[PDB]
Design a protein around this ligand. Structure first.
Ligand code: CDL
Ligand code: CDL
Ligand code: CDL
Ligand code: 3PE
Ligand code: 3PE
Ligand code: 3PE
Ligand code: 3PE
Ligand code: LMT
Ligand code: LMT
Ligand code: LMT
Ligand code: I49
Lengths: 347, 48, 171, 174, 111, 100, 140, 98, 83, 95
């Protein structure tokens, strides 16, 4: 890609998301998703190979189907209320269709199958956009329509994603697939608390984005896409292994790290609503994620895996990748727990 | 026609408000011949 | 819900203006000048009451003014007017610009024998003012009382008592 | 009767959808969608959507569906498989066709029907508007307003079409 | 509406520049500076002091305003809560308090 | 009704002409990819995208009747310029070339 | 699903066993059908008959568990004269677990299923008595 | 609801079931996607026209324009798939299974 | 400037079609702002009465509102007649 | 909107098309303009939790204008009864 075109396409991805976030009209929300989907396909395809073409096609079919269902919900809503204002929907069938459409876009279980396959088939930088920035637009719609969402449907979607995400990651050696299943599980926490306190949804989304960006950036710095490749980091950039260890323990939700905060506050909000079984089930199920985060730490930082002779040639050259914002992102990913009350800015 | 339908009140509004409401096509031509109804509904759309 | 009140078939009866649309088009410009006052009184009623049942009397006066208008054309200018609206009636679009000669004969006849002056371009599209003894409606929409606004919040903003109060945090 | 013209068109609309949705050869599927598009325009025309109806013909049929057939002839099918020769297509086609007929039979017999949801069956003419004597097309006034009220719609729509060109050139360069 | 710090927030005292939370934010900025040196294999403590200074300053600057919004949002929460309690006295009756001499509690021996 | 009659007459006649054209007395007793070319695909797609912009311009004769002519003229030109930019981009990226 | 669960919890415990066994068997059958549907869609059977055999195998296996739980738990409440007792559900839950071991022909799965499903049923009874909420309505 | 909405809602459901029950050709699933748009265009137009929502008269056109652009993107992906394997069969798009 | 004229002669010789296109497109953008007649387009469009002019209830304090269409008060189209 | 940029800047990006009782070209009103207006004015500023209960009358009337279900049902009843009587020859309709 021409560097100027790449910039304009990146800005269009952002503009489509921004349109969804500033719109009060349902048509403009739909347009924002359409524009956003159009601009993201070229960065899935940029490396031109059958795997990237399959991922782009699987992605296109899922998102196009979800956008058709969204437009149905909008039109049904118009028929029964005569208006387009972005807010609660005025028809339960419309609410189910929009909820299902937004669940499909977020890759929530049982509409999750595309996330591991699309992420695996695209470059790390494109996967970074797919699993972080692309969550913003659908989550911002859910933030506004949650009063009319069926509680049983949304909590069922959340519980399934936490189970599927947790179990799916156990069988993975590909880093992009580990991140994909990790993403699915984290979406479940975000939607489980949405009916009770959307602010906590925003907190979880922001922190998840920060830790997810950190991990993708650290994978990109070393061009690592598999567990075994990542296991060579100790013999090249020992500092990177320590940063990876700290970030993974944070994504595992271990105190005193930043990733404990969203799980901590979601459990609080659910208990205030006399929800005890569900948060307890979620917290215990999230141990599945901790298991396969811990597995990565064993092969990356806490043990030294076998190396190769040609690795010595790498010792003579420095890292030249941008690693933009990595020092800031890693510190926020791990050291933010003492500032937890700052979540009120999101109110 | 609705003289001996139990509970029926003749000319009862379906709206809560007492404001005048413009009748729709079926309210005016509901009981009239099909030729007139066709002209009132599709005559303009179908004209040449 | 209640009963829609409808006027009886007899209260609706009135003498009709049973002339075709080319006749009305031909006479429209003098008709607007001559019958403006009952016409504007009727249109004010309709847009203020928003109810056809409330302006039947004014609607009947509109008909009477038009009938008297066309009785004065018949008495004095029947032949020039007939040539004029027949000229209009021939056109599929009933165009004024195809009938300027005949319009001139009719215009000169009414001015001579009735003092009628054709309003100029732009006149009949003016917003005029009408004097009506009819009382201005109070609640034309038949609105219910609006719900009471939520209790407003007033006072001085002070710091949060002991800060966030979040678990163990002291600020 | 002609008073049910919109309903009759809607019935044909569904059969055309069952046509391509059972997915015969894409050549025939494209034909079924074209027939549904034309019938869909007719439904819109009978509600006063003259300009909207003709856009389906000009853009949906004359533009999008032409490109679909062009691409099918070039990258999908060059010779159609005999229609309904496949068992699943024939079964799906028959299954949908029977469902539509059972719907249509009952609504016409009772002048109503409950297929999941309640639908009146008196004829769509009953809901039409009873007063219209303006000197303009309301649909035309609304569409023309795109350039006065819809500045923001024009900007985002025009931008997306430009990005469409840029994106498609990137996709296909390979 | 869509305002980070509305004008009514100016009636609140500003956070002190020696706030312990603000100092921690500054420390986080310092840590980021060292991690920047480490990932690029520079001398961790000495390299690029101009860069290390901006890391601290940027964190403190952004941290100060985030703390200001944090405190204002909690002041608004208390303001809303107290106004609602005043508006609805019937839902927050002043409790009749008895002394432990009058209150009966069961005794549970530990034997 | 008239337009429906006209359409039915035109195509009914066309059917009949095809019929007799195929059956007159004779008096005798005895799905791959078609050598796919990417350039022709891009012509069709380019036509589609330009056709959608034409759909947006078709209202212009009515839009000129607005009192908001300042806004209307600016948006009309903006749309056409963006169409020109699309053509300029395709042109300079060799999208209008038939060689190679 | 809300209609069957309404029927089951409407009947008093330890009474009308046949009605209780029907509600749980139908509930078990539904779960079996749901499992079969996903199984057949995501794991294509080799033939039409193999797909039908699998659907019946899962569906009967699930209805067998639902029947035994309902019957055993309703008899325990009747025999013991202890309606509002979680132990009846624990007995019914373990019985269903053993069936799974038999249908899956295994001893470890049966033992594991007896304990996990037995505890789950007992927890379900406690939540019914104490009004535990799984999907709690937002209140604050 | 009015009688027409039954069939228009049915048409969307038929095309949605068609889209979700793939066969072999990827083109066939794209046609069902455009069928869904068509039924959405008709239902939206009917609602807007019947209610005399004047400014909303442009909405079906915007829907048509954006959906045609989405279809153009989908067709481009189909030809790239066809160039890779020689057909538009969806059974070939299974590399990311592993 | 001289470099500007040399550039224009070059394109005029090699690409007169594109030169004409850009010149016409430039005039279309610029000339409306320089034309003394563009103001009448706004006035004529506003002067076309599509809907009925609803009369005002006379409160006795509207000396600028005509009572009859042929009274002098109100907008005049004499500027349009002479156009 | 998630971020209410429009209100912050005072710019109208898409509010103009959100409701049918807003300003329209040439003051062309929607069929349910009066019902939408009443419902909007009833519900304004009190929040959807309160409005769902307190503006139910205006909203039910508005929904009747939108889809006309009760009106069609009433017409269905009168027509169905008329067909019965004519089938029994007990009613002759006037011209
Ligand atoms: C309260 C909650 C908790 C705290 C929240 C705090 C949130 C984070 C605050 C922002 C922290 C940003 C990092 C601080 C700057 C440190 C890097 C630095 O000193 O660059 C100096 C910069 C170049 O340093 P460098 O040698 O290229 O090394 C770059 C680092 O490796 C680093 O390069 P990089 O690739 O990582 O990019 C860093 C920077 C881009 O690099 C820069 O050019 C520095 C710009 C930092 C702006 C800080 C603004 C903070 C105030 C907000 C208002 O990004 C930005 O633009 C900031 C957004 O010199 C400048 O030009 C100063 C900026 C002039 C404007
Ligand atoms: C620059 C100089 C600025 C200045 O002039 O004032 C200095 C300032 C004097 O301020 P002051 O107004 O005189 O009152 C100071 C009182 O001591 C403070 O009295 P206070 O009433 O403000 O109480 C402190 C309050 C202040 O509000 C805060 O929450 C600030 C957070 C302090 C974080 C301390 C980091 C160490 C974490 C534990 C290890 O903390 C809390 O409300 C809750 C305690 C939060 C501690 C974190 C534990 C909960 C998170 C669990 C994860 C971490 C566990 C490990 O000196 C300090 O107090 C330093 C504050 C500590 C943070 C800044 C220094 C960085 C320390 C790095 C430790 C790294 C940990 C290594 C492992
Ligand atoms: C109102 C709602 C709308 C109603 C629609 C009305 C109809 C209008 C048309 C709608 C579009 C229909 C599209 C059908 C289609 O194209 O799919 C082709 C689809 C695959 O196409 P194929 O590549 O030619 O392969 C044919 C077989 O799948 C053989 O392929 P194989 O290689 O996989 O051979 C092994 C075979 C193995 O078969 C089995 O083992 C199934 C036995 C399960 C017993 C339980 O595999 C299958 O049968 C796959 C399906 C298994 C069942 C999935 C669970 C459901 O074939 C079918 O499944 C035919 C089913 C058509 C029935 C339509 C029923 C519509 C009702 C939808 C639900 C609405 C309820 C309300
Ligand atoms: C807060 C989180 C901020 C996250 C910032 C992360 C910056 C991107 C990671 C820095 C690593 C160096 C880098 O350039 O990023 C890789 C990627 C560019 O891709 P690359 O393969 O390097 O080459 C592009 C040319 N085709 O860079 C990109 O393409 C940008 C992709 C990341 C954008 C999404 C960031 C998450 C959403 C932020 C919103 C926060 C709320
Ligand atoms: C403050 C309030 C918030 C509290 C939350 C807690 C925050 C703690 C986490 C902070 C974020 C992680 C930052 C860790 C900095 C690591 C830097 C370091 O200690 O040195 C790494 C070391 C250097 O190796 P090298 O780059 O080659 O330079 C030396 C040449 N021999 O590289 C090595 O030698 C590798 C040695 C093997 C790895 C052993 C890992 C165990 C030590 C873990 C330390 C990090 C803690 C992780 C858990 C958190
Ligand atoms: C008020 C004071 C409080 C101080 C304690 C605060 C602890 C909380 C903050 C911890 C967060 C991590 C701090 C940032 C890490 C910076 C150090 C680092 O990453 O590099 C290790 C460095 C190795 O030395 P060097 O020979 O220069 O090799 C550099 C390799 N590129 O190391 C050096 O030689 C530089 C000398 C300082 C190194 C400090 C290492 C701290 C290790 C933290 C372990 C994780 C926390 C437990
Ligand atoms: C929204 C509300 C929807 C409620 C339904 C939610 C369930 C969605 C399940 C989606 C994930 C399923 C993925 C999966 O588990 O794989 C398919 C699985 C096939 O497994 P199976 O054939 O039974 O075992 C063979 C071992 N020899 O088939 C299954 O067994 C999955 C059964 C899941 C339902 C329990
Ligand atoms: C890549 C993006 C490209 C965007 C291109 C946009 C180009 C726009 C160029 C012209 C825009 C304004 O064009 C024209 O300017 C004159 C300035 O006097 C305006 O003003 C003129 O008309 C108005 C009526 O509204 C009168 O009140 C005014 O007296 C008259 O001078 C016109 O109303 C406007 O039609
Ligand atoms: C390893 C453990 C795995 C997780 C275990 C989770 C256990 C969760 C406990 C089950 C949920 C609580 O159980 C549920 O409680 C409520 C409380 O009235 C009951 O609610 C019922 O109330 C009345 C009867 O009192 C019924 O008429 C009504 O149909 C129903 O709403 C449910 O019928 C019951 O199913
Ligand atoms: C990513 C792209 C970045 C570029 C962003 C460009 C944003 C451009 C926003 C255009 C809309 C500006 O703001 C809006 O403009 C138009 C006139 O121009 C005004 O609209 C005006 O004309 C029409 C006709 O009645 C009506 O909307 C309204 O009566 C009137 O206000 C709006 O009152 C104003 O709120
Ligand atoms: N929907 C929810 N349950 N949560 C929620 N945001 N409640 C509103 C209560 C609240 C809490 C903290 C603050 I600071 C403020 Cl200002 C207001």
């Amino acid at each position: 890609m021409n560097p100027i075109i790449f910039i304009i396409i990146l800005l269009t991805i952002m503009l489509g998301t921004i349109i969804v976030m500033i719109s009060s009209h349902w048509l403009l929300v739909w347009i924002g998703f359409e524009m956003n989907m159009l601009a993201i396909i070229p960065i899935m395809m940029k490396n031109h190979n059958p795997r990237a073409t399959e991922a782009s096609t699987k992605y296109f079919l899922t998102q196009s189907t979800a956008s058709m269902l969204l437009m149905m919900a909008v039109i049904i809503n118009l028929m029964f209320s005569g208006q387009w204002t972005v807010m609660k929907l005025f028809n339960p069938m419309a609410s189910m269709l929009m909820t299902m459409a937004l669940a499909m876009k977020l890759g929530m279980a049982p509409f999750h199958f595309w996330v591991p396959e699309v992420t695996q088939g695209i470059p790390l930088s494109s996967g970074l956009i797919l699993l972080t920035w692309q969550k913003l637009a659908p989550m911002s719609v859910l933030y506004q329509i949650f009063p009319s969402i069926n509680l049983n449907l949304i909590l069922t979607l959340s519980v399934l994603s936490i189970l599927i995400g947790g179990w799916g990651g156990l069988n993975q050696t590909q880093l992009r697939k580990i991140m994909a299943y990790s993403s699915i599980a984290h979406m479940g926490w975000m939607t489980a608390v949405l009916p009770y306190n959307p602010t906590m949804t925003l907190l979880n989304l922001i922190i998840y984005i920060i830790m997810t960006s950190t991990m993708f950036t650290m994978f990109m710095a070393n061009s690592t896409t598999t567990t075994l490749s990542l296991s060579h980091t100790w013999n090249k950039t020992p500092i990177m292994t320590v940063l990876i260890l700290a970030t993974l323990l944070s994504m595992g939700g271990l105190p005193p790290l930043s990733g404990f905060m969203p799980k901590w506050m979601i459990i609080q909000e659910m208990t205030k609503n006399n929800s005890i079984i569900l948060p307890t089930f979620m917290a215990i199920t999230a141990l599945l994620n901790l298991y396969f985060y811990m597995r990565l730490t064993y092969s990356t930082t806490l043990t030294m895996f076998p190396s190769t002779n040609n690795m010595k040639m790498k010792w003579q050259f420095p890292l030249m990748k941008k690693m933009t914002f990595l020092p800031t992102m890693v510190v926020l990913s791990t050291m933010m727990l003492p500032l937890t009350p700052m979540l009120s800015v999101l109110e | 026609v609705m003289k001996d339908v139990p509970g029926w009140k003749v000319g009862e509004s379906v709206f809560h408000t007492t404001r005048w409401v413009t009748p729709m096509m079926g309210e005016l031509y509901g009981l009239r011949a099909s030729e007139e109804v066709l002209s009132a509904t599709y005559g303009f759309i179908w004209y040449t | 819900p209640g009963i829609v009140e409808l006027p009886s078939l007899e209260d609706l009866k009135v003498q009709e203006v049973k002339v075709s649309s080319s006749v009305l088009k031909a006479a429209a410009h003098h008709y607007g000048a001559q019958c403006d006052k009952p016409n504007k009184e009727f249109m004010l009623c309709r847009w203020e009451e928003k109810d056809p049942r409330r302006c039947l009397e004014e609607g009947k006066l509109v008909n009477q003014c038009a009938l008297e208008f066309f009785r004065q054309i018949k008495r004095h200018c029947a032949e020039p007017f007939t040539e004029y609206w027949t000229c209009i009636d021939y056109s599929g679009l009933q165009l004024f610009r195809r009938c300027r000669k005949q319009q001139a004969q009719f215009d000169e006849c009414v001015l001579d024998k009735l003092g009628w002056v054709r309003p100029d371009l732009g006149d009949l599209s003016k917003v005029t003012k009408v004097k009506t003894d009819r009382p201005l409606p109070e609640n034309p929409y038949h609105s219910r009382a609006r719900p009471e606004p939520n209790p407003e919040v007033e006072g001085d903003l002070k710091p949060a008592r002991h800060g966030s109060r979040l678990f163990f945090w002291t600020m | 009767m002609m008073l049910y013209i919109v309903f009759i068109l809607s019935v044909i609309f569904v059969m055309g959808f069952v046509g391509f949705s059972s997915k015969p050869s894409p050549i025939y599927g494209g034909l079924g969608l074209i027939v549904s598009g034309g019938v869909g325009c007719g439904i819109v025309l009978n509600f006063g959507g003259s300009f909207l109806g003709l856009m389906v013909f000009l853009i949906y049929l004359g533009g999008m569906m032409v490109v679909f057939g062009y691409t099918t002839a070039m990258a999908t099918e060059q010779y159609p498989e005999i229609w309904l020769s496949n068992k699943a297509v024939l079964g799906a086609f028959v299954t949908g066709l029977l469902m539509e007929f059972f719907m249509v039979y009952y609504v016409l017999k009772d002048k109503e029907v409950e297929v999941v949801f309640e639908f009146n069956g008196l004829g769509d003419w009953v809901i039409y508007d009873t007063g219209d004597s303006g000197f303009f097309s309301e649909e035309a006034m609304g569409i023309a307003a795109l350039y006065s009220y819809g500045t923001w719609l024009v900007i985002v729509t025009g931008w997306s079409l430009l990005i469409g060109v840029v994106v498609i050139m990137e996709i296909t360069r390979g | 509406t869509f305002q980070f710090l509305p004008d009514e927030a100016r009636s609140l005292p500003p956070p002190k520049l020696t706030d312990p939370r603000l100092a921690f934010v500054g420390f986080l900025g310092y840590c980021s500076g060292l991690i920047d040196n480490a990932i690029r294999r520079r001398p961790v403590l000495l390299a690029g002091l101009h860069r290390q200074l901006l890391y601290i300053t940027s964190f403190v600057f952004v941290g100060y305003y985030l703390l200001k919004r944090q405190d204002y949002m909690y002041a608004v929460r208390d303001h809303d809560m107290f106004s609602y309690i005043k508006s609805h006295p019937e839902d927050f009756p002043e409790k009749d308090k008895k002394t432990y001499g009058e209150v009966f509690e069961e005794f549970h021996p530990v034997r | 009704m008239n337009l429906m009659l006209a359409l039915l007459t035109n195509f009914t006649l066309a059917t009949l002409l095809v019929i007799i054209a195929f059956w007159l007395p004779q008096l005798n007793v005895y799905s791959a990819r078609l050598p796919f070319s990417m350039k022709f695909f891009l012509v069709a797609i380019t036509f589609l995208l330009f056709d959608l912009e034409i759909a947006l311009l078709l209202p212009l004769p009515w839009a000129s009747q607005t009192a908001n002519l300042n806004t209307m003229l600016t948006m009309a030109l903006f749309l056409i310029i963006l169409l020109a930019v699309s053509l300029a981009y395709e042109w300079t990226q060799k999208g209008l070339e038939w060689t190679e | 699903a809300k209609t069957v669960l309404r029927q089951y919890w409407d009947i008093p415990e330890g009474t009308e066993c046949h009605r209780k066994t029907y509600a749980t068997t139908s509930i078990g059958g539904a779960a079996g059908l749901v499992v079969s549907a996903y199984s057949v869609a995501l794991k294509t059977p080799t033939s039409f008959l193999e797909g039908v055999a699998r659907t019946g195998r899962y569906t009967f296996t699930a209805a067998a568990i639902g029947a035994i739980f309902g019957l055993t738990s309703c008899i325990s409440a009747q025999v013991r004269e202890k309606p509002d007792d979680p132990l009846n559900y624990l007995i019914g839950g373990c019985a269903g677990g053993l069936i799974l071991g038999a249908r899956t022909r295994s001893y470890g799965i049966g033992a594991a299923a007896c304990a996990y499903m037995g505890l789950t049923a007992a927890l379900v009874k406690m939540g019914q008595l104490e009004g535990w909420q799984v999907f709690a309505e937002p209140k604050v | 609801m009015s009688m027409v909405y039954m069939n228009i809602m049915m048409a969307f459901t038929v095309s949605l079931v068609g889209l979700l029950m793939y066969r072999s050709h990827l083109m066939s699933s794209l046609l069902c996607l455009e069928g869904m748009m068509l039924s959405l265009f008709v239902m939206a137009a009917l609602t807007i026209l019947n209610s005399h929502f004047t400014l909303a008269s442009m909405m079906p056109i915007i829907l048509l324009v954006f959906a045609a652009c989405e279809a153009a993107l989908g067709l481009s992906l189909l030809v790239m798939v066809s160039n890779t394997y020689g057909t538009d069969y969806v059974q070939n798009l299974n590399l990311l299974q592993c | 400037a001289e470099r500007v004229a040399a550039f224009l002669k070059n394109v005029w010789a090699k690409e007169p079609v594109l030169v004409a296109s850009f010149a016409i497109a430039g005039l279309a953008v610029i000339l409306p702002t320089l034309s003394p007649y563009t103001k009448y387009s706004l006035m004529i469009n506003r002067a076309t009465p599509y809907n009925y002019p609803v009369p005002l209830r006379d409160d006795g304090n509207m000396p600028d509102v005509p009572s009859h269409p042929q009274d002098p008060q109100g907008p005049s189209l004499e500027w349009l007649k002479r156009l | 909107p998630f971020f209410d940029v429009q209100k912050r800047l005072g710019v109208d990006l898409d509010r103009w098309m959100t409701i049918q009782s807003a300003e329209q070209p040439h003051k062309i009103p929607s069929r349910c303009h009066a019902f939408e207006k009443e419902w909007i004015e009833c519900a304004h500023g009190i929040g959807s939790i309160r409005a769902e209960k307190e503006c139910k009358i205006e909203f039910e009337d508005f929904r009747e204008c939108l889809l006309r279900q009760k009106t069609m049902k009433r017409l269905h009843a009168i027509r169905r009864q008329r067909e019965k009587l004519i089938k029994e020859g007990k009613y002759t309709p006037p011209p």
